[PDB]
Design a protein around this ligand. Sequence first.
Ligand SMILES: Cc1cc2nc3c(=O)[nH]c(=O)nc-3n(C[C@H](O)[C@H](O)[C@H](O)COP(=O)(O)O)c2cc1C
Ligand SMILES: Cc1cc2nc3c(=O)[nH]c(=O)nc-3n(C[C@H](O)[C@H](O)[C@H](O)COP(=O)(O)O)c2cc1C
Ligand SMILES: Nc1ncnc2c1ncn2[C@@H]1O[C@H](COP(=O)(O)OP(=O)(O)OP(=O)(O)O)[C@@H](O)[C@H]1O
Ligand SMILES: Nc1ncnc2c1ncn2[C@@H]1O[C@H](COP(=O)(O)OP(=O)(O)OP(=O)(O)O)[C@@H](O)[C@H]1O
Lengths: 364, 364
Amino acid sequence: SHMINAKLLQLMVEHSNDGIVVAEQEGNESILIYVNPAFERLTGYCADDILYQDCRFLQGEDHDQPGIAIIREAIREGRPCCQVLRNYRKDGSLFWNELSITPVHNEADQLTYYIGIQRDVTEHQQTQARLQELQSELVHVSRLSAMGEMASALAHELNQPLAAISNYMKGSRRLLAGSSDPNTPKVESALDRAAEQALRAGQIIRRLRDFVARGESEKRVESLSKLIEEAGALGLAGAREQNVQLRFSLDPGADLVLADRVQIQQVLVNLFRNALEAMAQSQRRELVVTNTPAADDMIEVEVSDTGSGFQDDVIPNLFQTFFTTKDTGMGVGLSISRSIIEAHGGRMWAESNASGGATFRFTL
Amino acid sequence: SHMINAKLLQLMVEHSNDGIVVAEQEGNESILIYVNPAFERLTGYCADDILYQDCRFLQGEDHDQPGIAIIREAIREGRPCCQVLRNYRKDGSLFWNELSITPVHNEADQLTYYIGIQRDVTEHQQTQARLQELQSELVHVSRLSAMGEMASALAHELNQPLAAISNYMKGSRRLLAGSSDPNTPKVESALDRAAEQALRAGQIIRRLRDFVARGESEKRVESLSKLIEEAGALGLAGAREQNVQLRFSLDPGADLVLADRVQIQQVLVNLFRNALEAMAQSQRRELVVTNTPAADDMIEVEVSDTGSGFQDDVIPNLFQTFFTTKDTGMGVGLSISRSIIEAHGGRMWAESNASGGATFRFTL
Ligand SMILES: Cc1cc2nc3c(=O)[nH]c(=O)nc-3n(C[C@H](O)[C@H](O)[C@H](O)COP(=O)(O)O)c2cc1C
Ligand SMILES: Cc1cc2nc3c(=O)[nH]c(=O)nc-3n(C[C@H](O)[C@H](O)[C@H](O)COP(=O)(O)O)c2cc1C
Ligand SMILES: Nc1ncnc2c1ncn2[C@@H]1O[C@H](COP(=O)(O)OP(=O)(O)OP(=O)(O)O)[C@@H](O)[C@H]1O
Ligand SMILES: Nc1ncnc2c1ncn2[C@@H]1O[C@H](COP(=O)(O)OP(=O)(O)OP(=O)(O)O)[C@@H](O)[C@H]1O
């Protein structure tokens, strides 16, 4: 049964864009007997140089890879195997090789051959590792930031009552100054100790607040394209699921800003999450990000959605700490974002959009 | 130039474990002219049924995939393309097809053919999506848990001073009870207001504490294998990098426990991070996880490393809130872990290991 002529197959294999090799078993060596030009391009070795010897030279000295042992076991067993490992071109460049090997037995000559299809997954590996770094740093930064915001909010809430207590103690001392009652000394002493405890309370606040503020707010030259893509990999994963239409109408002339990177990443991740959640129950789901020039040699970024939008009595409350409309929401994202923008030398505000959604703007 | 006979190539292609097809361009249709048995197995269609018609029937009614348009554009242009999309077997099963297509022009008959190598990436896609779900839920749970622990720690720190203030106010009122000084009423009133403010402070504590405790501590029947693997995907990624040797010496007879899943995931993620960090600067890096039967129809889990270990004056401080030895550490992991184990009906403790590392045990 021949569906196509073997010449045609050979032609397709030769011109395929994936590296395709065929090897022959000779004891512990699986010598190459065919390589297609895609393999030559991927590896940089010429076919005249590497025929009739095992492919393991692509590993170099990097033999500390479990995939190698997996492949050796698969060859010994006789089963196929797909594995991804680090290989090196003739010039020394490192690349990630996803190779599928199928051992097949030729009964014409009773030999064991293998067909190997190999492709470059280096870009996928790099993006995935970058995403892992981002997820780890984002978890650490989110824990620290939430704790710090909690501490600051408590301090602000408790400043009035402790101050009032101190002032009452001061006033009571002043009233008792001119007293002849025998109990007055003890009373005074009692009040004194009370005052001490009040001050101690304040101290405790700072003693933990500064404990969690152990992170310095750096600012460096940063590419907006880069930090938008870094934030997007975490926050904008899953656009296909909610059928959200993404549009980045970006200006190549307004790309470089002065910013930190972990803080802008966390601001954008939070904005992206809030926008995706607000458009989760929307009919038309479209998110637009745009940059424009602004005053004071700044650049303004606008993010507009078709989400749940802002009710009339909502917009001036958005940035107040603990304000949320969600059952499980905390209401910390925008407060942290506003503190980050103000620390970096910009302004942030919100408005309703003409589609019933929300438009956020900030400057840097 | 023929390195191998075309019959041999055909044989290798036929027996390859990856689906390999060859198609021919006829206007808007790329009709299949060859399919290898791997493709038949992957799709479930017989070659006699599907030859000489376009592959798009594998999509079914799921045409809302951008990869389809990408491939159509690539075919129009004439370039290769690798894309992953959802396809469906003849029985209706869904699978993830990674297909690489290379268009090649045959000048023998001046036609355009395509060679397509297609493999199943369904398992990889599922594991990656599960990891995305885990990272999202872990971020949310970590923010909430950190905030709650912060609030509880503040409350515990501030209980003494506020109580002391209240007691001083009470004592002062008792001393002033028997007084004739004209200023005594005002003094009393002042103290009264002071007392109010003290109580208000306490109220504020609860008003935020219960605000962040908006999460119910569920407990369900859970597989230890499953929750260890779920926690490992996040926390144990990167074993190859630090050359850490993982050993799960597990008991199939002691696999089912009564536990929550998000909370045990977060406990294990934290333990895995602490163990990886402690072995980061170690010479021999080996992590062992083991389960054994314990009293009261419980099961005890042991996790041992060769890490930095415990100094003599360290072990009884490990679980106290804010205790850490790291420059950027917060010291919240073990306190939360102990509260989780105690809520689920178990005990948790630590000891030094014979290799200079740390051994942690818990019961459920
Ligand atoms: C057809 C075929 C292609 C192979 N291609 C590669 C390759 O591209 N890169 C690589 O590092 N190993 C490749 N290998 C694996 C090595 O040839 C070798 O089998 C592997 O290192 C395990 O054997 P070893 O432990 O003796 O090295 C290939 C093997 C076969 C059969
Ligand atoms: C060689 C080859 C193999 C293909 N294999 C598949 C496949 O396995 N599954 C699939 O959904 N589409 C596959 N396609 C793509 C479809 O044939 C079709 O070209 C694609 O849907 C874009 O064209 P359309 O928009 O007219 O459908 C393959 C295309 C070629 C050339
Ligand atoms: N694009 C938007 N459209 C409509 N409402 C919005 C939008 N963005 C924010 N909001 C509302 O304003 C609030 C601002 O608070 P924030 O976004 O920080 O809260 P959250 O994301 O619920 O909290 P957290 O991130 O701390 O769990 C949101 O909780 C939500 O109620
Ligand atoms: N396996 C271990 N070997 C040696 N020291 C350890 C080990 N596990 C924990 N420790 C020490 O005990 C402390 C227990 O606190 P915890 O692990 O919660 O802190 P952390 O991970 O630094 O803090 P956080 O997770 O809140 O940032 C650690 O900070 C560390 O100093």
